[PDB]
Coordinates of C-alpha atoms in Angstrom, one line a residue:
Chain A
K1 CA -4.4 11.6 23.9
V2 CA -5.1 7.9 24.8
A3 CA -4.9 5.2 22.1
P4 CA -8.0 3.1 22.0
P5 CA -7.7 -0.6 22.7
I6 CA -7.1 -2.7 19.7
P7 CA -10.0 -4.5 18.2
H8 CA -10.5 -7.7 20.2
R9 CA -10.2 -9.8 17.2
Chain B
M1 CA -3.9 1.6 -12.7
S2 CA -6.5 1.3 -9.8
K3 CA -6.3 3.5 -6.6
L4 CA -6.1 1.4 -3.4
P5 CA -7.6 2.8 -0.2
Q6 CA -5.3 4.9 1.9
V7 CA -5.4 5.7 5.6
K8 CA -3.8 8.2 7.9
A9 CA -2.7 7.0 11.3
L10 CA -4.3 8.8 14.2
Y11 CA -2.1 7.3 17.0
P12 CA 1.2 5.5 16.9
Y13 CA 1.2 1.7 17.0
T14 CA 3.8 -1.0 17.8
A15 CA 3.4 -4.3 16.1
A16 CA 2.7 -7.0 18.7
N17 CA 4.1 -9.7 16.3
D18 CA 5.7 -10.2 12.9
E19 CA 2.3 -10.3 11.1
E20 CA 1.5 -6.7 12.3
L21 CA 2.7 -3.4 11.0
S22 CA 4.1 -0.7 13.2
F23 CA 3.5 3.0 12.3
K24 CA 3.6 6.5 13.6
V25 CA 1.1 9.4 13.8
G26 CA 0.5 10.9 10.4
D27 CA 1.8 7.8 8.5
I28 CA 0.0 7.3 5.1
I29 CA -0.7 3.5 4.9
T30 CA -2.0 1.8 1.7
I31 CA -4.6 -0.8 2.4
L32 CA -4.3 -4.2 0.6
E33 CA -7.2 -6.0 2.4
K34 CA -9.9 -5.4 5.0
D35 CA -10.9 -7.8 7.7
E36 CA -13.1 -7.1 10.7
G37 CA -11.2 -4.9 13.0
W38 CA -7.8 -5.4 11.3
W39 CA -6.7 -4.2 7.9
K40 CA -3.7 -5.2 5.9
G41 CA -1.5 -2.3 5.0
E42 CA 1.7 -1.4 3.3
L43 CA 4.0 1.5 4.4
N44 CA 7.6 2.1 3.1
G45 CA 8.0 -1.4 1.9
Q46 CA 6.7 -3.1 5.1
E47 CA 3.4 -4.9 5.0
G48 CA 1.3 -6.1 7.9
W49 CA -2.0 -6.1 9.7
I50 CA -3.1 -2.8 11.6
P51 CA -5.8 -2.1 14.0
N52 CA -8.4 -0.2 12.0
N53 CA -9.5 2.1 14.8
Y54 CA -6.0 3.6 14.8
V55 CA -6.4 5.1 11.4
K56 CA -8.8 7.2 9.4
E57 CA -9.5 6.3 5.8
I58 CA -9.0 9.2 3.3
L59 CA -12.1 10.4 1.4
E60 CA -11.9 9.5 -2.3
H61 CA -14.4 10.3 -5.0
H62 CA -14.8 7.2 -7.2
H63 CA -16.3 4.6 -4.9
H64 CA -18.2 6.7 -2.4
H65 CA -20.7 9.5 -2.6
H66 CA -23.1 11.4 -0.4
Chain C
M1 CA 6.8 -6.8 9.2
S2 CA 6.9 -8.6 5.8
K3 CA 9.4 -6.6 3.6
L4 CA 8.1 -6.0 0.1
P5 CA 10.6 -5.6 -2.8
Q6 CA 11.0 -2.0 -3.9
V7 CA 12.3 -0.9 -7.2
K8 CA 13.4 2.3 -8.9
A9 CA 12.4 3.2 -12.4
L10 CA 15.2 3.4 -15.0
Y11 CA 12.8 4.9 -17.7
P12 CA 9.4 6.5 -17.8
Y13 CA 6.5 4.2 -18.6
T14 CA 3.0 5.1 -19.8
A15 CA 0.3 2.4 -19.0
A16 CA -1.1 0.8 -22.2
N17 CA -4.3 -0.1 -20.5
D18 CA -6.2 0.2 -17.2
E19 CA -4.3 -2.7 -15.6
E20 CA -0.9 -1.1 -16.0
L21 CA 0.8 1.5 -13.9
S22 CA 2.4 4.6 -15.3
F23 CA 5.6 6.0 -13.8
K24 CA 8.5 8.4 -14.2
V25 CA 12.3 8.0 -13.9
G26 CA 13.3 7.9 -10.3
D27 CA 9.9 6.6 -8.9
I28 CA 10.2 4.1 -6.1
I29 CA 7.6 1.4 -6.6
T30 CA 6.6 -1.4 -4.2
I31 CA 6.1 -4.8 -5.7
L32 CA 3.1 -6.8 -4.6
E33 CA 3.1 -9.7 -7.0
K34 CA 5.2 -11.0 -9.9
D35 CA 4.0 -12.8 -13.1
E36 CA 7.0 -13.5 -15.4
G37 CA 8.0 -10.2 -17.3
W38 CA 5.3 -8.1 -15.5
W39 CA 5.2 -7.2 -11.8
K40 CA 2.3 -5.7 -9.9
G41 CA 3.4 -2.4 -8.4
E42 CA 2.1 0.2 -6.1
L43 CA 3.1 3.9 -6.2
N44 CA 1.3 6.7 -4.3
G45 CA -1.6 4.5 -3.8
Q46 CA -2.0 3.5 -7.4
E47 CA -1.6 -0.2 -8.3
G48 CA -0.9 -1.9 -11.6
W49 CA 1.3 -3.9 -13.8
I50 CA 4.7 -2.7 -14.9
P51 CA 7.5 -4.2 -17.2
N52 CA 10.2 -5.5 -14.9
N53 CA 13.0 -4.4 -17.3
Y54 CA 12.0 -0.8 -16.7
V55 CA 13.0 -0.9 -13.1
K56 CA 15.9 -1.8 -10.8
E57 CA 15.7 -3.6 -7.4
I58 CA 16.7 -1.6 -4.3
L59 CA 19.0 -3.1 -1.7

């Protein structure tokens, strides 16, 4: 249930 | 009229700044524009950029096929 | 975090062509762009032009 990291962008 | 793409939020998100759009799980967000990694969405009169890996675009039957 | 105007339909409208958006009384439409008498609206994922006298702005 972990959010992924946001797109490094 | 034309049908814009829609997405359903898989995870909640909190806008890091005023250009981004916060949302909750299950929210149905209409997409106005796609960039790399970030899409511009509209939900309940609020518009902003969202991380595109937080959402899943809903299958439609006009512009895709397999 | 930008607020878009939202409007409520006063009357039903049937789109006269493919660029217009049909709607029913009561529908709450989000406005994306304005050109004089016609405003570009979005309702349940459908986008198109509507007559601005058929709707009323929400607070």
